[PDB]
Amino acid sequence: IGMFNEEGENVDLYIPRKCHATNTLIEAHDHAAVQISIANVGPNGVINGTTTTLCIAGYLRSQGESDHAINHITIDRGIMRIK
């Protein structure tokens, strides 16, 4: 997922996270840059084994589309219900 050497050796220093809204890389120096981990649920309403986590870039929180963007993602993920 990074630039590979002709010999196949992965050359990257690290592979940054990408905003799940804007698809922008999250930079080391970006201090909004949130993860939001929603606990995944199963019947009877108990938490088990929840991997679904959102990444939002510093840009987007400061305009206040973080909320609008997390509605869009949780709906594509099915964590939410349109009605």
């Binding site: 199963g42 009877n44 609008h68």
Partner: protein
């Protein structure tokens, strides 16, 4: 899995506890949450949109495995006592009164604290917590008026933040909802404590 859908008691309470009513005016955001007007001018919130933001919040919080990470705040007296007991039942840390600028961003201080998550009553009257939450990579879960500035606010629940009764439910419904998930409370029955126990003091 139709569980964590709202149901007739949930709705009644809000409709009874008036959490569904907004301030007269309106921000750009928090329009999708607003439903129509009254003749008094107030805005009315979808009980649907409101609700799903609650379990979403509650799913964020039940995914915090050390509840001393979560940090609940307000500067509003009306939201001071609600903070308090919610923080007991769920376990969360809490700070009311006047948020001291610098608690998140000053190392050397002793009162320095590093939460994962923040919860704020009011996105206005707490701008000092949200702001510094933006320096330290802290997601935010805010109870929001129709007005609330959503700057740096990742997950916003529509509510009455005004008035004592309206807030106390909204932490009462969270803690109830959070605990139906974590900490094993019996979903089949009404829960133990009383809302009366989340309300502001004055003698």
């Amino acid at each position: 899995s139709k569980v964590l859908r709202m149901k007739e008691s949930d709705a009644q309470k809000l409709l009874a506890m008036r959490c569904h009513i907004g301030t007269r005016n309106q921000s750009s955001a928090m329009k999708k949450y607003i439903y129509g007007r009254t003749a008094e001018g107030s805005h009315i919130i979808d009980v649907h949109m409101m609700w799903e933001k609650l379990i979403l919040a509650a799913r964020v919080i039940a995914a915090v495995e050390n509840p001393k990470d979560v940090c609940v705040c307000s500067s509003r007296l009306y939201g001071t006592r609600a903070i308090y007991k919610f923080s007991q039942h769920v376990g969360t840390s809490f700070h009311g009164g006047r948020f001291i600028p610098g608690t998140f961003t000053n190392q050397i201080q002793k009162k320095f604290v590093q939460p994962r998550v923040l919860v704020v009553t009011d996105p206005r009257t707490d701008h000092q917590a949200i702001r510094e939450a933006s320096l330290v990579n802290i997601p935010v879960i805010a109870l929001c008026d129709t007005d609330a500035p959503l700057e740096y606010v990742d997950i916003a629940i529509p509510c009455n933040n005004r008035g004592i009764k309206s807030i106390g439910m909204m932490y009462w419904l969270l803690a109830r909802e959070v605990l139906r998930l974590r900490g094993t409370i019996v979903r089949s029955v009404p829960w133990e404590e009383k809302v009366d126990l989340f309300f502001y003091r004055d003698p």
